[PDB]
Amino acid sequence: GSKKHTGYVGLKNQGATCYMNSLLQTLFFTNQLRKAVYMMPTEGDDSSKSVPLALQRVFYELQHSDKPVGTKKLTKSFGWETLDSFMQHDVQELCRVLLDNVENKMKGTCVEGTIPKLFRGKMVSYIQCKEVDYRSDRREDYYDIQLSIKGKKNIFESFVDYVAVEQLDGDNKYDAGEHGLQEAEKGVKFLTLPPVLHLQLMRFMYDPQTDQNIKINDRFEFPEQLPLDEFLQKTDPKDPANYILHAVLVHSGDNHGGHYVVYLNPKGDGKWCKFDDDVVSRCTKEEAIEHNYGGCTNAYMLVYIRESKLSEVLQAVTDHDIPQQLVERLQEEKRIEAQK
Ligand SMILES: [Br-]
């Protein structure tokens, strides 16, 4: 009775979908994304082709069902029906496939641009020659950050490594065009961080020593409250880059196989639940955070929310926020299913 115990319902365990159920709940409790998802015009869409419609159905069922929620129409919609599709991708790639479809269908509607407003940050990637006066600056958008964890104690050391300067010398000098091969230094700088911050922790890497993918179970620490102002080029006095832990996506075991689980405090109030496929239960703040540091269970992905955006991002979602037309289609679909 996980609806009774926590107010929330889980997702069925109906295939080797790995990180997918963890990711789906993470997006579901991004309330502003969920509300915008309900506003996509999918009335004319096909019921077995539309990723827009199928994520609406998942979100609607997660919001209304008392029983665990299936995902078969979702996985058929984006075309990942074998484990080979999930082994060949990681969680940030599935997140991009889901949000890209969702962003495109919002073009031309009243919620257009919801995906970049929530997940998009801006960075600058540069190469600077030392002996000649050349610099190449590349402004880039990002929707997620991949952070290395080997040889780093915590998130702060990972961000330090992320923004560090790489020296281009010797057999890896820089091609500076009319200047020939030049010694140079290369780095990235953050200009903005988005309201919802998706950080992947690189525990799954390719081993160069073998021809086998490995998992790094080393200890790596992350805080409930993460201050990131000092990694911005310019800080805002009225909006410091202080971030609040929302979600901890966890794996235990080997790279092949293993158990996938997500921890969340949906309201951002530090009251945590464990979402283990069809079973949702209350848990302590220590089980969600400290007990996933490593040293079996450990975190491979974190979601933070900017403190000034927390009330907006986690805005309340009523049944009235689902348009009555969408409700009628989904309840008609379920009435067709109920006759099955
Ligand atoms: Br299903």
Side-chain angles (χ1 to χ4, degrees), residues 1-3 5-11 13-34 36-42 44-46 50-66 68-71 73-75 77-83 86 89-92 94-95 97-106 108-116 118-121 123-129 132 134-138 140-149 151-152 154-170 172 174-182 184-185 187-205 208 210 213-233 235-237 239-253 257-270 272-308 310-319 321-323 326-327 329-331 333 335-336 338:
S2 69
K3 182 69 173 182
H5 293 348
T6 70
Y8 310 111
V9 81
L11 296 161
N13 181 23
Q14 13 172 239
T17 51
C18 314
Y19 41 79
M20 187 189 72
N21 283 352
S22 285
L23 175 62
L24 282 175
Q25 298 279 18
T26 289
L27 302 182
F28 179 63
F29 291 112
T30 317
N31 284 13
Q32 190 181 351
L33 170 61
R34 191 215 308 188
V37 156
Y38 290 145
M39 300 305 299
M40 290 148 107
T42 60
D45 281 19
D46 186 270
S50 164
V51 177
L53 179 65
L55 194 63
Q56 280 168 331
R57 170 190 302 124
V58 172
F59 280 2
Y60 172 86
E61 285 297 327
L62 278 173
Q63 191 176 319
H64 292 260
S65 171
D66 313 318
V69 172
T71 68
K73 283 187 180 242
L74 181 55
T75 51
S77 75
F78 54 82
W80 297 10
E81 310 185 323
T82 180
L83 170 63
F86 283 95
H89 294 80
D90 45 36
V91 60
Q92 61 258 43
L94 172 66
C95 191
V97 175
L98 288 183
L99 302 183
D100 277 353
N101 294 43
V102 158
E103 173 179 341
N104 285 115
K105 179 66 93 155
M106 291 180 185
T109 80
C110 74
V111 291
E112 177 175 344
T114 291
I115 271 63
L118 286 173
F119 303 99
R120 200 268 309 278
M123 72 190 307
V124 163
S125 107
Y126 65 95
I127 301 173
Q128 172 69 56
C129 290
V132 317
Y134 189 80
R135 184 181 192 94
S136 175
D137 277 323
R138 184 192 174 159
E140 318 203 44
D141 290 359
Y142 66 89
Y143 288 69
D144 46 56
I145 304 179
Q146 293 75 70
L147 294 173
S148 84
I149 70 116
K152 325 266 152 66
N154 53 60
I155 289 288
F156 169 80
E157 289 183 351
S158 291
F159 269 95
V160 166
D161 176 275
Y162 194 90
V163 197
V165 162
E166 182 191 335
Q167 301 283 321
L168 310 168
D169 46 11
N172 356 89
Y174 172 61
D175 182 4
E178 339 170 353
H179 301 113
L181 286 168
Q182 295 293 318
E185 46 177 48
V188 301
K189 312 184 293 168
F190 288 100
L191 312 179
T192 69
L193 299 139
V196 182
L197 181 65
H198 285 4
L199 315 166
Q200 283 81 43
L201 316 177
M202 303 308 302
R203 287 180 184 273
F204 302 85
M205 334 202 76
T210 67
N213 293 342
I214 55 103
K215 181 189 182 205
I216 298 158
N217 288 307
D218 296 347
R219 188 185 176 83
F220 181 85
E221 291 189 330
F222 53 93
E224 155 177 271
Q225 299 202 115
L226 175 58
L228 290 179
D229 251 357
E230 97 190 68
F231 306 111
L232 287 169
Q233 283 305 283
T235 65
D236 182 356
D239 192 5
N242 298 327
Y243 277 86
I244 306 294
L245 185 58
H246 194 227
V248 190
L249 288 72
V250 173
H251 173 268
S252 70
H259 188 35
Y260 288 86
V261 147
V262 60
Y263 292 86
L264 278 129
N265 53 315
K267 301 184 161 215
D269 52 11
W272 288 84
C273 293
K274 173 178 191 251
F275 293 78
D276 184 3
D277 290 327
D278 41 299
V279 174
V280 190
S281 46
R282 289 274 284 128
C283 64
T284 64
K285 183 182 296 181
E286 297 73 18
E287 178 172 349
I289 295 177
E290 282 89 338
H291 293 161
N292 294 314
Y293 280 176
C296 259
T297 351
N298 50 51
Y300 64 91
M301 176 177 168
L302 313 182
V303 178
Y304 285 83
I305 299 187
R306 206 198 190 96
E307 220 189 17
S308 52
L310 209 120
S311 52
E312 172 156 348
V313 166
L314 300 179
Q315 66 185 260
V317 189
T318 64
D319 310 339
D321 290 317
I322 314 188
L326 187 61
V327 171
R329 175 182 184 142
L330 302 180
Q331 289 194 35
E333 256 202 333
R335 286 198 315 282
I336 291 177

